[PDB]
Design a protein around this ligand. Structure first.
Ligand SMILES: CC(C)[C@H](C(=O)O)[C@@H](O)C(=O)O
Ligand SMILES: CC(C)[C@H](C(=O)O)[C@@H](O)C(=O)O
Ligand SMILES: [Ca+2]
Ligand SMILES: [Ca+2]
Ligand SMILES: [Cl-]
Ligand SMILES: [Cl-]
Lengths: 364, 364
C-alpha cells in the first residue's frame, strides 16, 4: 500500500548526499501522489562504532521489512586498519547480497553531452561518446563458491577459492541482459575467459542457449583481457556487457572511471521479485565529508533507479532523471565537474539538491 | 658452450618478424663473439595444419633440448572456430608454461619519448609518461588449480575452477618483484582482492613477510578493481606491480593498451634456472601478414630479453635495446606509429630490421 524504504546512509558523504536524495523524493511523493515511509538504520563504519559490527541484526531485520534499500556509502580511513575481511564495505555488502539473493547488478554508464572533456580518454575517443550498461552476476562464481579457506602450515600452507556456476544461475542473469539490450541498441557482449576456465566454457554455452529467445539481439563473446583493452579504443561500440561476478567487478569499475564523472553514476542490485539495493557507484569520499562540496547526483539517481525497478513507478523515476539533465545543462555543476579555472562557479551539495527538487516540483 | 635456441615463429606475422629478430641476433653474434644455434619447430595454427595439434611432441622435445624459446605469435581466424579450449593460443601456451614451470612473467611497459600522443589517455595524462613493470605469477592460481570441470545435467549442471596458492608459490614471485623494484624506483604495488578471496588474504600476508628482506623498497597493496581505475588517472605513480595469474593477465594487457604502442612491447616467462620463453606482447595480426608492414620491434626486444635473462649476456641485450632507441629517435617508424598524415613516411618490416641490425654492427 504505503511503500517502506530502509535508509542505510553509512559513512563519509553518505548522510549529506542522502539528505538531498530524500529532499528530491519528497518532491516526487507530492507530484505523483506516492506514500513512502523511510526508516534509517546504521551500516558500515558507523555501525561498527555504534554496534560492534558492520551489519547489525536490527539493520538486517529492518531491510527484511522494507520494499527496497536506499544505500549511501561505507568505509573510510578509520576502519581501513582492520583486516580486509573485517572492513565495513565487504562486511555490509556481501551478506546483504547473499541474504536477499541479489543476483543482478546493473551499472549504467554514459558520457554526458558537454562533459566529454572530463573522461581520461584522448579527446578524439571521448568526443564519440559512449553509453554502456554492465550487467554483473552478483551471487555466484568465486565470491560465494565453496570450498573456500586455507590448510597446512609454513611453506606449504595454502589458500583456495572456488568459482562455481550452474546453468540456472547463468541463464537468469543472461535473460536480463538480453531483455535490456532490446530496449537499447540490441547488442549483448558477453565477457568470459573460456580459453582457461571451465566456468567460462559453461557461461558461453548457456548464453548461446538463451540467445535463441532473442533473435533480434546481436550476441558476441569477448575474453576479459581483450575487453579491458577494447574499452580504451572503441567504447562506443558496446551496448550491454554481460559479466560474471569477478569479471563484472573489474569491468564495471573500469567503465565508471572512463566517464571521468563518478559522481553521476548509480548502481542497482536486485532479486527476481524486484526488491533491491540502490547505491552510488563511487565511495565514501571521507576527505570532503561535512563540507557541502559532495555531488549528490549519484545518490539522487539511485533513488530514481529504486522507483523504477523496485517500486515500479516509471513516471516518477523518469521525472528525476530529467531534473538531473536540466541541472547538468543549466550549469548546475559541483566542483569536481569543472576545470579548476571554472572552480568558482561550483554549486554546493544543497544548491544541487534544491535545484533538482525544484525542477521536479515545477513539472519537468 | 654453444647456446641452443628453439625458434617457434607460429602464425600470422610471427615468421616475418622472427626473420628480423634473427637478422639482428646475427649482428649481435658477430659483435660479441657468441655461438648460437637455432632450430625451428611448428607451434600453434601451423602445427594444427601440419601435425594435428598445436604443440606437437617433436616441438616439446625440441624445447627441452634448448637454452631458451624465442616465440612469435599464434592464432588467427582459421582456427577461431574450434572450441575456445582447443584453439592454438591456449593449446600451445598453457602446456609450455606448465611443463617448464615458467612461474615468472615479466612485461615491461613504457611510454616512449615522442610517442606519447599514440596513448589512448588524455594528452595531459600521457604527457607525464609512465614506466611500469608487471610481474605476473604464471603457474599457480585459477589457471592450473584442481578440481576443475563440470558435473550434473540440465538446469543444475555446474562448472567449477579452483584458485589455489601456497606460501612457497607467492614468496618466490614476490622476491622477483622486490629485486626488480630495487633496480628501478623502489616501489612494489601488490594487487589482490583480499576483501573477498582467501587466496588474496594469503597473498597480501606473504608479500608482507617477504618485504622484511627489502627495507629500502616501499610496498603498497591495492584491490584489482581500484588498480584498473587508478592506472587511468596516475599511471606514472606505479613502478613494479605484482599480480597473481588471473589479475596479472588483465592488468598487464590494460597497461599494454595504455601505451598505444603494442608493437614495442615484449614479454619474458621464466623458471628459476632462467630457462624462458620470450615473445611479443601483441598477437598474430593475420590481416597484415606477408605485406612487410608489421612492426618487428617487439620480436627484436624479445630476443634482447632472452640474451639478458636466459643467456646472461647483458652487454648484447643492451646493444639491441640501444639500437631500437636509435631507430625510434631517427624516424624509423612503421605505419601504426604514425598519425595517418605521416603515413607515407612509414618504414617496412625489412627496413626496420636492416636499420637495427646495422646499428648493432656500427657499435651503438
Ligand atoms: C567491497 C567489494 C566486495 C565490492 C565487490 O567486489 O563486489 C565492491 O568492489 C563493489 O564493486 O561493489
Ligand atoms: C591465451 C591465454 C591463455 C593467455 C593467458 O590468459 O595467460 C594470454 O591471454 C596471455 O596473456 O598470454
Ligand atoms: Ca568494485
Ligand atoms: Ca592476456
Ligand atoms: Cl566469478
Ligand atoms: Cl589466479
Amino acid at each position: 500500500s504505503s511503500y517502506q524504504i530502509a535508509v542505510l546512509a553509512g559513512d563519509g558523504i553518505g548522510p549529506e548526499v542522502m539528505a538531498e536524495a530524500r529532499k528530491v523524493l519528497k518532491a516526487v511523493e507530492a507530484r505523483f501522489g506516492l506514500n513512502i515511509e523511510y526508516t534509517e538504520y546504521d551500516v558500515g563504519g558507523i555501525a561498527i562504532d555504534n554496534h560492534g559490527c558492520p551489519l547489525p541484526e536490527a539493520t538486517l531485520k529492518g531491510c527484511e521489512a522494507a520494499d527496497a534499500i536506499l544505500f549511501g556509502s561505507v568505509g573510510g580511513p578509520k576502519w581501513e586498519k582492520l583486516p580486509p575481511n573485517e572492513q565495513p564495505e565487504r562486511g555490509a555488502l556481501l551478506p546483504l547480497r547473499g541474504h536477499f539473493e541479489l543476483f543482478c547488478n546493473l551499472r549504467p554508464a554514459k558520457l554526458h553531452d558537454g562533459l566529454e572533456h572530463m573522461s581520461p580518454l584522448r579527446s578524439d575517443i571521448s568526443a564519440r561518446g559512449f553509453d554502456v550498461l554492465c550487467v554483473r552476476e552478483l551471487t555466484g562464481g568465486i565470491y560465494f563458491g565453496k570450498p573456500k579457506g586455507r590448510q597446512g602450515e609454513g611453506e606449504s600452507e595454502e589458500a583456495f577459492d572456488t568459482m562455481r556456476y550452474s546453468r540456472r544461475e547463468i541463464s537468469r542473469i543472461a535473460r536480463i541482459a538480453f531483455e535490456a539490450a532490446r530496449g537499447r541498441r540490441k547488442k549483448v557482449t558477453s565477457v568470459d575467459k573460456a580459453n582457461v576456465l571451465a566456468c567460462s566454457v559453461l557461461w558461453r554455452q548457456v548464453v548461446e542457449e538463451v540467445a535463441v529467445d532473442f533473435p533480434d539481439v546481436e550476441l558476441e563473446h569477448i575474453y576479459i583481457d581483450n575487453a579491458t583493452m577494447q574499452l580504451l579504443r572503441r567504447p562506443d561500440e558496446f551496448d550491454v556487457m554481460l559479466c560474471s561476478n569477478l569479471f563484472g567487478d573489474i569491468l564495471s569499475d573500469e567503465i565508471a572511471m572512463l566517464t571521468g564523472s563518478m559522481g553521476l553514476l548509480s548502481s542497482a542490485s536486485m532479486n527476481s521479485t524486484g526488491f533491491g539495493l540502490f547505491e552510488p557507484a563511487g565511495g565514501s569520499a571521507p576527505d570532503i565529508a561535512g563540507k557541502g562540496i559532495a555531488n549528490p547526483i549519484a545518490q539522487i539517481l539511485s533513488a530514481a533507479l529504486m522507483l523504477r525497478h523496485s517500486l515500479k513507478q516509471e513516471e516518477a523515476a523518469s521525472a528525476i532523471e530529467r531534473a538531473v539533465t536540466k541541472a547538468l545543462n543549466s550549469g548546475y555543476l559541483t566542483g569536481e565537474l569543472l576545470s579548476s579555472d571554472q572552480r568558482h562557479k561550483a554549486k554546493t551539495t544543497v544548491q544541487m539538491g534544491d535545484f533538482i527538487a525544484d525542477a521536479v516540483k515545477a513539472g519537468v
